[PDB]
Amino acid sequence: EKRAHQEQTEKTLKQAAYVAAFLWVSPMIWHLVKKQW
Amino acid sequence: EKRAHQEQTEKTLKQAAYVAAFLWVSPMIWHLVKKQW
Amino acid sequence: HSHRQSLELVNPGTVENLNKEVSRDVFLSQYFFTGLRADLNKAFSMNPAFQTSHTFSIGSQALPKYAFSALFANDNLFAQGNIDNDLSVSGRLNYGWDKKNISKVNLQISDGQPTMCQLEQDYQASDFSVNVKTLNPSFSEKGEFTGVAVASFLQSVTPQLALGLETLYSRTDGSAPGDAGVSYLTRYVSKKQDWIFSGQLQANGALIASLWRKVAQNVEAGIETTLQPTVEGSTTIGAKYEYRQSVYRGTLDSNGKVACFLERKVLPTLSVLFCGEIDHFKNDTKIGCGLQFETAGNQELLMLQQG
Amino acid sequence: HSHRQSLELVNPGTVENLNKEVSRDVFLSQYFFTGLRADLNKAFSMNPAFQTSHTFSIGSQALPKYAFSALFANDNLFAQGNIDNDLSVSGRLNYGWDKKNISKVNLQISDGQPTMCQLEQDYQASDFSVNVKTLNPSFSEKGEFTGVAVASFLQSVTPQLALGLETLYSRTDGSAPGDAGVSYLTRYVSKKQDWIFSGQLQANGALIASLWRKVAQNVEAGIETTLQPTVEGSTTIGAKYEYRQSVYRGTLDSNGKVACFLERKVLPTLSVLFCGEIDHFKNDTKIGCGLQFETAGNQELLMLQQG
Amino acid sequence: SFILSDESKERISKILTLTHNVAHYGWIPFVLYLGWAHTSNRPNFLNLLSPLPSV
Amino acid sequence: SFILSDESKERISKILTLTHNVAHYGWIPFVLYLGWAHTSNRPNFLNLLSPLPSV
Amino acid sequence: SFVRNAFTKSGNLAWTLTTTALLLGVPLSLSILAEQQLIEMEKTFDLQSD
Amino acid sequence: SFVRNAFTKSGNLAWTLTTTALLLGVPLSLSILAEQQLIEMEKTFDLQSD
Amino acid sequence: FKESPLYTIALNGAFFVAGVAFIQSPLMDMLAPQL
Amino acid sequence: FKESPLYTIALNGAFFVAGVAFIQSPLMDMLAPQL
């Protein structure tokens, strides 16, 4: 059972990193959106 | 057993009356004592 | 009779007020409560005294959830009704036939059973006071007396000493003979009235004696020791501080519990009560705050209240 | 990097202070107590902040019988020890390497077992705040991480909106894989800063969201709704009134319980606290008064205190 | 020395019972009526009962 | 991606244990010493501990 | 009776509302009174000053 | 140890005495403070009058 | 009587919305004392 | 350890006497505030 637990924990951490980058760049994309409209 | 109970109650009431008279006259006897000494 | 009346003795207080200076003044026994409690009082007239109280007590086993009371009082008549949650009705009526002679009847009813019904006539004289009360009086087919009958006599032997007895007759069912006991009371007042001592050799070898002293216009303290097979008694030390803005009462018990009672008069009407106690023998505390609102319903009464 | 930095965003508050405006300001969750409690505080210096508190709580299950605490604080260092009855020692040390970077370590010990030992480093930047904490950290022979590790990141997307995540790693024994969960937080501040909204999609589908509003300089109110198989959540409404002489906090709960917290500053030093609550679902009340004495031990401190 | 056991005892018992029954329901109304009659203002019953100042 | 499992882990564990043990007994004394040293008055220990104003 | 049930429920609700109102207002009321008295005190001090 | 027993008993007694002193003094102290403030208030009113 | 698991969330959300409307309404400002 | 039935009465009487002496002593007068 350790296989699935490790896999899900690692995927959770990877998703956390992905959203962390998302939030880090968020001001930039909001600036781009503001320019667009 | 009612005999003893009635007798003791009646004697208690009689003693109560006796001390009631004692207290009623108490100022008088205190006055007499004060006169004596 | 004629020659002996040169003494000019003073009438001693009634038997019930024998410990008033201590039990009901410098102790919390009557003022103590627990948990929150709001007391709203409404005044409608002054010359003929009338009043409509309310109560909202939560967290106090002794107190009720709600209690409506109306108190009416005049120069020679005094009545008070008290509706309580669960439709428990309590009532007390006092009628004075003469200035010094008053008949009092109290009646408590709970769920259709007149559990309490006492009728007592109080007589006061120049030197002695006598009152007789009958608890739950009634009559039986066999004709013997039923219920509890109590008679008390107090005579002032000297201006600074009063002695009296307290006769008790009780009969529970009437089938068996009703036990009767007698108790002895003594009340001593200092020549200057600075300190008042009261002793009570209650029935069944019970001794309830107390003392009262007036330290100053603001401070008065008193002590009360109780005794009741093996005896079970406690000694209580209490003091009360009264001021134009607040009344403080503190008490240390022989059982170890320590209690105080502070009543702040934030406003002439609104008074906030704080009541806390500690039990050092079991290390638990019972504390209750409260309220006392006195709002009139008449323009004249409000004008008098504001001055 | 270079062109995008024209935004000039403001640093959002740390993750822990996300609900400070409501949970720790306009609610009694932290200030509530039960039964009597006396708190004596001693101040010895001001420029280098030093203080020696004491506590005497009786009747409160949560509070201890006695608790000696000493709090030391300066410009960049802050330490606090707390001895408790039963020799339960609690301690917290905060060291700021840089003005905006601070490392905090908390340690609670009870009967020789360091049950709590968290070490966290807090980093604050122009636009984002990140802090990582490790609860009961340790190492094992197998080499894998042990204990609970928590990391939180908050970045201000816009001056009036900040978003962030909250990563949790927990491992109880180490033999089994350590469960890890992620939580999402959102904080919105009005342009005028009049009202602050905060949302928290906590782990295990738990949603803790609250709002804050500043009615006036004296009145601020906020709301907090909690949610946690079947859910178990409550909604809380609270308001706080602050004045030069007293601080009032009231709160109505969805569970029906109603509570208030009054702190009267009778004197600049002595402050008397009253804390009462009611539980309309079971009709019971828990009320506790208290004290707060702040007496200095230095002539300069007393001169400053009196003005 | 108790002696009373006649018809007067039954009279007293019935009087006690009836006065208990009537009082249990009418005592508080008795006091309220006495007060509202004695008071010169004579406030209305609903305001009198309620714990609010009318003046 | 956890990797630390060497001798440094034993060092960290022993350090944690010893720092826990010493702190449990000396932490409050640490704060008291820091305060009484920083304060210019330097009040005596017995008065410092007691909750009474010395001035 | 259903009417009796409604009566008792209404009475209980009124009692609960009154209890909550007193608990949440009395301390607030004391705070307002104290603040209003203090401002009056400062008012009196000033009028003394000038 | 018997010495430890005496120490803990003395500490408990001191705690009890302090608790009783606070409970019976704090309300009294507030009463004295209020009375003393009120007399000062009357004092100030009079000095205003004359 | 339904008392759904979603009933609790619906009730809490409704209370939250009512409270947010009340707080941000002029009424809350009125609750603040004039003094 | 005796704890006699009379021990309770002796203790209560001793407390009463100590209290009566303390109350009627100048000390009680001192307890009254000067103000």
Swiss-Prot record, chains A, B:
Q: Where in the cell is it found?
A: Mitochondrion outer membrane
Protein name (Swiss-Prot/TrEMBL):
Mitochondrial import receptor subunit TOM5
UniProt organism field = Saccharomyces cerevisiae (strain ATCC 204508 / S288c) (Baker's yeast)
| Range covered out of full length | 13 to 49 of 50
TM helices/strands, residue ranges: 15-33
Q: Give the protein's biological function.
A: Component of the TOM (translocase of outer membrane) receptor complex responsible for the recognition and translocation of cytosolically synthesized mitochondrial preproteins. TOM5 is involved in insertion of preproteins into the TOM40 translocation pore.
Q: What's the domain of life for this entry?
A: Eukaryota
| Coiled-coil stretches noted in the UniProt entry, renumbered to this chain | none
Q: Main localisation, per the record?
A: mitochondrion
What is the gene name? TOM5
Gene Ontology BP, a term = mitochondrial outer membrane translocase complex assembly
UniProt record similarity statement: Belongs to the Tom5 family.
Curated annotation (Swiss-Prot), chains C, D:
**What UniProt keywords apply to this chain's record, in alphabetical order?**
Ion transport, Membrane, Mitochondrion, Mitochondrion outer membrane, Porin, Protein transport, Transmembrane, Transmembrane beta strand, Transport
Q: Please, which domain of life does this record's source organism belong to? A: Eukaryota
What is the annotated quaternary arrangement, including any partners?
Forms part of the preprotein translocase complex of the outer mitochondrial membrane (TOM complex) which consists of at least 7 different proteins (TOM5, TOM6, TOM7, TOM20, TOM22, TOM40 and TOM70). Interacts with mitochondrial targeting sequences. Interacts with FCJ1.
**Where in the sequence is the signal peptide annotated?**
none
Q: Subcellular location, in the record's words? A: Mitochondrion outer membrane
Indicate where this protein is primarily found.
mitochondrion
The UniProt similarity line reads:
Belongs to the Tom40 family.
GO function terms (MF aspect): porin activity; protein transmembrane transporter activity
How does the entry describe its membrane topology? Multi-pass membrane protein
Gene Ontology terms: cellular component: cytosol; mitochondrial intermembrane space; mitochondrial outer membrane; mitochondrial outer membrane translocase complex; mitochondrion; pore complex
Question: What name does UniProt use for this protein?
Answer: Mitochondrial import receptor subunit TOM40
Q: What does this protein do?
A: Channel-forming protein essential for import of protein precursors into mitochondria.
Question: Which GO biological process categories is it annotated with?
Answer: monoatomic ion transport; protein import into mitochondrial matrix; protein insertion into mitochondrial outer membrane
Q: Which gene encodes it?
A: TOM40
Organism of origin is Saccharomyces cerevisiae (strain ATCC 204508 / S288c) (Baker's yeast)
From Swiss-Prot, chains E, F:
List locations, semicolon-separated: Mitochondrion outer membrane
The chain's Mitochondrial intermembrane topological domains, given as residue ranges, are 37-55
Q: Where are the transmembrane segments?
A: 15-36
Q: Which InterPro entries match?
A: Tom7
Which UniProt key words apply to this protein? Membrane, Mitochondrion, Mitochondrion outer membrane, Protein transport, Transmembrane, Transmembrane helix, Transport
What's any one GO cellular component for it? mitochondrial outer membrane translocase complex
Report the main location listed first in the record: mitochondrion
Q: What does this protein do?
A: Component of the TOM (translocase of outer membrane) receptor complex responsible for the recognition and translocation of cytosolically synthesized mitochondrial preproteins. TOM7 is involved in assembly and stability of the TOM complex.
User: Further remark, if any?
Assistant: Present with 3250 molecules/cell in log phase SD medium.
**Descriptive protein name:** Mitochondrial import receptor subunit TOM7
Species source reads Saccharomyces cerevisiae (strain ATCC 204508 / S288c)
UniProtKB/Swiss-Prot annotation, chains I, J:
Q: Which domain of life is it from?
A: Eukaryota
Query: One cellular component GO annotation, for this chain's record?
Result: mitochondrion
Keywords of this entry: Acetylation, Membrane, Mitochondrion, Mitochondrion outer membrane, Protein transport, Transmembrane, Transmembrane helix, Transport
- The membrane spanning regions, by residue number, are 6-26
- Please report the record's description of how this protein sits within the membrane: Single-pass membrane protein
GO BP, sorted A to Z = mitochondrial outer membrane translocase complex assembly; protein import into mitochondrial matrix; protein insertion into mitochondrial outer membrane
**Compartment(s):** Mitochondrion outer membrane
Q: Which residues lie on this side of the membrane: Mitochondrial intermembrane?
A: 27-35
Regarding protein family, the annotation reads: Belongs to the Tom6 family.
Subunit relationships:
Forms part of the TOM (translocase of outer membrane) complex that consists of at least 7 different proteins (TOM5, TOM6, TOM7, TOM20, TOM22, TOM40 and TOM70).
Its job: Component of the TOM (translocase of outer membrane) receptor complex responsible for the recognition and translocation of cytosolically synthesized mitochondrial preproteins. TOM6 is involved in assembly and stability of the TOM complex.
The name this protein goes by in its record:
Mitochondrial import receptor subunit TOM6
Q: What is the lineage of its organism?
A: Eukaryota, Fungi, Dikarya, Ascomycota, Saccharomycotina
Which residues of the whole protein are included? 27 to 61 of 61
